[PDB]
Enzyme design. Sequence first.
Site, PDB file in Angstrom:
ATOM      1  CE  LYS F 154      82.973  53.255  89.250  1.00 55.33           C
ATOM      2  NZ  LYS F 154      84.155  52.688  89.924  1.00 55.33           N
ATOM      3  CD  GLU F 180      86.367  55.645  96.993  1.00 58.99           C
ATOM      4  OE1 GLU F 180      86.323  56.775  97.421  1.00 58.99           O
ATOM      5  OE2 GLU F 180      86.184  55.338  95.729  1.00 58.99           O
ATOM      6  NE  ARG F 181      93.424  54.033  92.724  1.00 59.50           N
ATOM      7  CZ  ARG F 181      92.706  53.149  92.043  1.00 59.50           C
ATOM      8  NH1 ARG F 181      91.386  53.183  91.975  1.00 59.50           N
ATOM      9  NH2 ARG F 181      93.336  52.177  91.394  1.00 59.50           N
TER      10      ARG F 181
END
Lengths: 54, 487, 128, 128, 466, 466, 14
Positions: F154, F180-181
């Site tokens: 990815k 987003e983390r």
Amino acid sequence: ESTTSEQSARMTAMDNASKNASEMIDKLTLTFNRTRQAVITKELIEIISGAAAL
Amino acid sequence: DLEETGRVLSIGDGIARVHGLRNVQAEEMVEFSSGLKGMSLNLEPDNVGVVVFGNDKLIKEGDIVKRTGAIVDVPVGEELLGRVVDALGNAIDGKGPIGSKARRRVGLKAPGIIPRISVREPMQTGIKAVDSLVPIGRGQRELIIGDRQTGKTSIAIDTIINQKRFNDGTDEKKKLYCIYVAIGQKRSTVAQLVKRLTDADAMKYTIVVSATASDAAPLQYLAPYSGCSMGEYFRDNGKHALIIYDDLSKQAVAYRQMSLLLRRPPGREAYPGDVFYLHSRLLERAAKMNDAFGGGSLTALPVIETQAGDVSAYIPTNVISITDGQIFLETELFYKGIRPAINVGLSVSRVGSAAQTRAMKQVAGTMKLELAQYREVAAFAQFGSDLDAATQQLLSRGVRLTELLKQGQYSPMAIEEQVAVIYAGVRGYLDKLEPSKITKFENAFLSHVISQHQALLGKIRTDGKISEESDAKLKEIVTNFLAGFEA
Amino acid sequence: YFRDNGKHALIIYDDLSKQAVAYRQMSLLLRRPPGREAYPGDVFYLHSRLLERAAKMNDAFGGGSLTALPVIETQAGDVSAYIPTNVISITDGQIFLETELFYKGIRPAINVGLSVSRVGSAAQTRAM
Amino acid sequence: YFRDNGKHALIIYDDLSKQAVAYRQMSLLLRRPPGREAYPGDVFYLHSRLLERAAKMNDAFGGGSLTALPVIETQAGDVSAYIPTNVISITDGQIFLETELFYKGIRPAINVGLSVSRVGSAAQTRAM
Amino acid sequence: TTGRIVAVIGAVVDVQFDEGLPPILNALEVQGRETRLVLEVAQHLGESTVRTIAMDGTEGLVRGQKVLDSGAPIRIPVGPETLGRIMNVIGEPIDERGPIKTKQFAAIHAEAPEFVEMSVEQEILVTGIKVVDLLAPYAKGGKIGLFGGAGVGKTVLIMELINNVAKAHGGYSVFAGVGERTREGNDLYHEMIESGVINLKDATSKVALVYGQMNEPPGARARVALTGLTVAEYFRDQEGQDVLLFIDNIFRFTQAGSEVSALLGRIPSAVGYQPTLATDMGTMQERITTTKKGSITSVQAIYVPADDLTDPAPATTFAHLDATTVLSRAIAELGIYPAVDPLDSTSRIMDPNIVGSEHYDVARGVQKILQDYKSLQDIIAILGMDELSEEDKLTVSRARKIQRFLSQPFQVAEVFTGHLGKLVPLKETIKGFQQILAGEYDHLPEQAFYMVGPIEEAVAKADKLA
Amino acid sequence: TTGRIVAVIGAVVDVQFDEGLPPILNALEVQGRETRLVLEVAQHLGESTVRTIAMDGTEGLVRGQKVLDSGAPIRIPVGPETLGRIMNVIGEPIDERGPIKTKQFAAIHAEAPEFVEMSVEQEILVTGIKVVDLLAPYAKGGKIGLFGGAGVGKTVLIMELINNVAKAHGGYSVFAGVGERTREGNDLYHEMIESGVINLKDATSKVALVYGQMNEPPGARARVALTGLTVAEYFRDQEGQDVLLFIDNIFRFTQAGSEVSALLGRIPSAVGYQPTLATDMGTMQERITTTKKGSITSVQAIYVPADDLTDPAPATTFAHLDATTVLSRAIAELGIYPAVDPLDSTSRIMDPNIVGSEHYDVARGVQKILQDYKSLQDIIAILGMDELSEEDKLTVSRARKIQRFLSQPFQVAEVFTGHLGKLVPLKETIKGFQQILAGEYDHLPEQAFYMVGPIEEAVAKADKLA
Amino acid sequence: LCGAIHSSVAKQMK
Ligand SMILES: CC[C@H]1O[C@]2(C)[C@H](OC(C)=O)[C@@]1(C)O[C@@H](/C=C/C=C/C=C/c1oc(=O)cc(OC)c1C)[C@@H]2O
Ligand SMILES: CC[C@H]1O[C@]2(C)[C@H](OC(C)=O)[C@@]1(C)O[C@@H](/C=C/C=C/C=C/c1oc(=O)cc(OC)c1C)[C@@H]2O
Ligand SMILES: Nc1ncnc2c1ncn2[C@@H]1O[C@H](COP(=O)(O)OP(=O)(O)NP(=O)(O)O)[C@@H](O)[C@H]1O
Ligand SMILES: Nc1ncnc2c1ncn2[C@@H]1O[C@H](COP(=O)(O)OP(=O)(O)NP(=O)(O)O)[C@@H](O)[C@H]1O
Ligand SMILES: [Mg+2]
Ligand SMILES: [Mg+2]
């Protein structure tokens, strides 16, 4: 002879059996997913309904 | 002051709560300081709830709202043809103002019992499957239904296009002005849509309303009613229009968005109780008037998108329960390469047999019949050996007949052409042949009789039936062509 | 305190499910709007705020860390119900335990096939 | 009347399903917030209160009795259903009839397995 | 009395009065309009205001507008002069044939016949439809219901029945089109003309037509049933007449009810429906009935939403019929017409003491075999028939032929079946079904049974195949 | 205008203005807070009060606190000096490289390209990726659904696309991480940096990063995709390039939508989502297209809830997608990279009417062959690879050559793949597969095709391999 | 479960 005919038969037979099972796994999932969704909605509507009556 | 005007009390959730406007009527169009438009929905003891026909960012507490004394209506008349307007009638082709003389409420009630008559005039699509097995009549409501990307719109189009053959013709009563309403679509798509229409010189006879993926729900909502009013002019004046609602699915979600925001009890699928009516009212307006009323007509081909082929859902069922048949396109068919992905058994035309031409009756008549006997033995089972000649033979037409129904886009056929090729299959001229060649036969055989025998075709078309000579003449024609066909 | 001071600390939240319930209970009693399962629209944010406070610092910051093992109780293995959904989506991986496995003799009940570690080998020893 | 006067009575409530809807209606129209499945939060109570009345009085009270046979309609033979279970948990047993059995020839369609009597043989002659 | 329009929302118009507050159910006439706009009072909100339901579109109304108490509820022309005419919810003609000149007028809201007025005679009504007649026979002066999801056969079945029964009926008939297609009304009217049941020349029409279709605002759809109903009541009581009453579709009424319910300001019940669902069905369904004074055989089509029979609407309706014909998509899609579910359709007449035991026994015979088939179905589905017992395979054979013989061509559906419509006499059905059961045809192929009238024709079809 | 705070309930602040009320969408600044608190406007409750949604913790707000109407929606620094920087929702720097100093600022809430700006035609956008370009061609201005997650390349594919856009189209790219983390952001950062796409030293950065971390309130994770959009719109509307927009992940966009919705107390719709699901989407998706000035192309990371493709979230989303890029763990495990699925990945523009007969046919050739081999795959393993015909043996051989030829070296992965990167051209792509199908290299052996660019390299590799 | 084996012989055996 009776073994060629047999191992032939089982073959095809089991071939359609999974063919049937597949048509089913695909079919049931859909019922699942329709129900899944419906359950969620049903609840929310109940909540909202009671909140709104206060 | 306050009799014809109002100051906004609050905007939020697309419902402007106006104060004043003591004289508005229910459903009258009103105007915002920002030239935005709205419909007076609720007439309450001390405010008017109005539905804003655009982004509500523009509206603010305290803005001025002015009546217009007009129940919501829209520009109507022949001068829309070739125009790309918005849900309000406003031009969006940036091609200059629509010079319209007439106006027409979006909300009128459909014609009653008395003024109508059984659909009797064919509404040719130019699509083999459709015109042979699922005949549309003029004034019918026929639903196009299927999942995403199954080629739904593609049917609407080939239909629009096929019309040129008559609009560029002789008689007014054999024509059809098309109206294409686009709801929730991508502009990128509509834009490209007209391009195709334009290059086909079909826009000349088409009007195009757009309430796209980006327009306020209320506009998406409203769009189909507008188009419908425009189609109504033609119905109303001895003329014949064709309206395409793409899709009613997205309109339905727009209205639902409106309804949850207004706080109306959500029901099945969270849809408000009146979505059926959202549609019945609309589709009741397509109709075939009788002579005493002009003989005119409106034909609706509304589109509905099912999820996973689920034809039982609330919306699909609703719409099925309104139209006069359906055309179900199947995903399986599509992949498998059978295009138009029509499901010949499922699909129906409740009122169209009469509308259908005899000639097709003549060939198409024995086609579902042959295809009925094939439907059966044509299993899921890929690897099946068989016996019995009869049942074998039946299985062989079917594969041919099915090749006969495959059709590409943008190539609508003349009824006479269709009967031609159908003849070939239904009479046996293709039995001695291999399924992979059917396609190839068709184009080749077709050009041949198009080039060479415009003479017979014209009779067929003109007669409208297949006379003994014509049939006799045709028979040898398939005969010879065959004899010379290279594998 | 540990993390920041160049020290390492492990934290187990047992369970986030119960806390979600405590939060839901106040939200509804304060009359805030209820969404799916009656949970407030900021329940996601309640955990994310929490589970993000764990992290590996930079030497520039002390190199100290805070690993967190949060517990979620599913229902009838409905891993996609609301809260289980949130937290799975917030965390770096999941250790999925199962009854059928448990009773079949697999103890601990880890469903190896569905369990995950986004961090992966970046945390295993060469030996392992 | 009969029960309290040393006489014996039998009462059939046919059916308690339609009464619940009436209760629901009556109740909602009084603006009492709807509960599970739209019914008032007290439908259980609505029925308990009633069926408790069926009873066996001791000799001190005439030894009379009231026996009740309430009827409830399931949908898609689903006995697990909320109302169904609400009433099954009040009565001293249930007679569950299945259309499957019926069609099969088993008339009455009593489903042995699913029907019970919490009184057992104490209500049976020794012969039986 | 004159009130003033206070508020307007869709079909819910709130009108205030100063001197005379009109009772609930009273029809008010809005003043200042091109055409008649009747408002039916629904409730007293107090503060001298009444909340009403319009009977037509409300566009154009203005707050402060004048409304007039009609003094009574919606009243409509009743008598024989309605025969052969098409009328509105509010009783005005819509057939462009002038005014309906009657002696009496009746109000659409009446109370249901009393207990003591009830009747209990039970006579079988033969329809000529195999499945119906055999398994869920209708009954004279009885209550029949056709349940059907979209496009399953409800209307076609009503037509076929109108054809097979209404056509040769002595008394009168009343068709009420509720919430359905306008073209259908039109399709019918003209057809009625043709076969002479409607005569535009003499007074020889046997049918009165009432319509409030898919194009009307909710309130209208919510009342037209009542309207057709009323007309029928007249013939029943006032002339001890034997009536026939066809309604398409009664589901629409309830739907209509759900449309205005929120507007009336009610907390919704399950599935967003109005909390008064059952009672509304009730006080309405209870007037559609035979009595000591007269007979009303009524056939009503019942739309099933999303195909869900557990939907409050249909669900609540079962309890009002004497015989029910539940149509199935699954069956129809299989190509079985009429798409009747044999194990799901029932009739209070399916009693040995009424249909005779011969009938009773074939009936239950047939069902038993289909039930049996049913259990075998899970297995046949993965493994087919191979693994089946010789005995089992025999139920299957028989069941597949009994299953096929249950289908049949209707005249009305000739255009689709490609075959000539058939009417099978009861004894012919009882019979043909015995034989099948009794193994008298285990040699014929299934296909022979498909789409036929009498058994005799099935034997032939077998020769033709062979 | 200077307003006061009237109420604070979680992340929803109500603010009262004395004279002049900020329109909906405006960004208000809260006065006197350690950090910047932007409240976006949502509704005009009437009475001079607005209802806003906070973009960060309302943690210490006080009734009466001062709020300054910035007289406009959230505006952000746009332009070149954004490339390589990391930015907040309100255009702030979160990479600690000081101020983002651009000339122009751009409000995030913008309308979409009028109909008359729309391009009328479909053009493939080439990325240089053999699978992507040959079997699931991206579309200029279109939207692509990138399925598959970790372990499968990815982030490397996202990074090659970036690079190849700068290379082949002189276009730049944006990255919007919606929800987003924080961990994963910082990890993406350094990863782009290490591969060059970002350059901290110079001005050769080809990407701008926009972040909406998971801890941020609903409103924040709600808008960040728009912010990313604003930025991309510049490189198209100001510099008419072909920008790349990456939204990771499209689902969290919708979800963030619901949260905000619920907070605004609006009734949820089917499955719990917002009533405005379709519009919330459309108002954003539609800004992604090919205008006359340029085009934005979006790669959207999709999460499918409950594995239910008919779930409202996903379903809605597909309404806009022109192609899917399915990353597959199965393929990767065979070593195949980029691990794209040649049979599952799709494109709307794979129409001869669009890609042209040639392109179209090759493609349709690659797939069928790939399809056929799949069949034999079952036989091979069981009955052994030999009942195989002179024919069945070629389909395989080729298919196996094909499968490999469909693999490829990325320039992003050169830092230690040892193997140099390839940006195969469309022309070379079709020729390539054309020939294998053709059979020019049937003699050629497998490992000649593994990880190479143009067919020419398939030839030379064979040389080096005897 | 061998297809119509055991039966085919079974029938023709009587
Ligand atoms: C799921 C449908 C069920 O509904 C039935 C009542 C059966 O359920 C049980 C309890 O009985 C069922 C399993 O199968 C149907 C059988 C349908 C048969 C269709 C036959 C069609 C057919 O049969 C022929 O013999 C020749 C034909 O074409 C020339 C055609 C179309 C019956 O209606
Ligand atoms: C699910 C796997 C399938 O997806 C494919 C497309 C094929 O499906 C069909 C339709 O074609 C498939 C069966 O096999 C994969 C093939 C993988 C091949 C891997 C080759 C690896 C490899 O090949 C070499 O020649 C040398 C190597 O290392 C020196 C390595 C690692 C493909 O991607
Ligand atoms: N008759 C046809 N023969 C071959 N290809 C076709 C045919 N009709 C459509 N297509 C292809 O099918 C695609 C989908 O058809 P289209 O009309 O867009 O379907 P749809 O049902 O409207 N899909 P959508 O509107 O996205 O829900 C087109 O883009 C063509 O590539
Ligand atoms: N008895 C029948 N035999 C053959 N085909 C039939 C029969 N009944 C219905 N159909 C087919 O099914 C279609 C729908 O029939 P119809 O009687 O209109 O259904 P319905 O229940 O009235 N539909 P709707 O009222 O829209 O829900 C018909 O037009 C025929 O194509
Ligand atoms: Mg379409
Ligand atoms: Mg009908």
